[PDB]
Amino acid sequence: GFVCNTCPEKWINFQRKCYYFGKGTKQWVHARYACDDMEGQLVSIHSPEEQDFLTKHASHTGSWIGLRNLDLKGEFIWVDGSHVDYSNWAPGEPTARSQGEDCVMMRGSGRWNDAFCDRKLGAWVCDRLATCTPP
């Protein structure tokens, strides 16, 4: 057996992961470190079910997530190194011609927009793996 749904206080479980819905005005790199210093990382998203869960708890005024154009060539990848095997980009996003808009945020609808990394948003989402109880 082995059930993996234990999360630290203040975190919320969904499937095998734990999620922290942070509040407080931050630009992307600041949110990146807030997550890191809590033993998590800016969230990566891998299914409709996981997106649906995030949308349910998402801040209405937008949140930083863990997707960024790290290689500076137009390919948006997860900072946690996980596979890009799902997307919820808003229609037309990411824009082909938007130099500098390398960071990614999630709107209240849950759909993703690129953004200048120094934009200030009032929310940001972290994740980490849940720990497990022995059967």
Author numbering: 157 to 291
Please quote the paper that reports this structure.
The second principal receptor for IgE, CD23, is a type II transmembrane glycoprotein with a C-type lectin-like domain (CTLD)4 (3, 4). In its membrane-bound form, CD23 consists of three CTLD “heads” connected to the membrane via a trimeric α-helical coiled-coil “stalk”. The interaction between CD23 and IgE is critical in the regulation of IgE synthesis, which can be up- or down-regulated depending on the oligomerization state of CD23 (2, 9, 10). We have determined the crystal structures of the human lectin-like head domain of CD23 in its Ca2+-free and Ca2+-bound forms, as well as the crystal structure of the Ca2+-bound head domain of CD23 in complex with a subfragment of IgE-Fc consisting of the dimer of Cϵ3 and Cϵ4 domains (Fcϵ3-4).
The S252A auxiliary binding site mutant crystallized in the same conditions and same crystal form as wild-type Ca2+-free derCD23. Similarly, Pro-250 is trans in two copies and cis in the others. As predicted from the crystal structure, the introduction of the S252A mutation did not affect Ca2+ binding, but unexpectedly, the D258A mutant was unable to bind Ca2+ even though the aspartate forms part of the apparently nonfunctioning auxiliary Ca2+-binding site. Ca2+ binding to the mutant derCD23 molecules (E249A and D270A, principal; S252A and D258A, auxiliary) was consistent with binding only to the principal site, with the exception of D258A, which showed no Ca2+ binding.
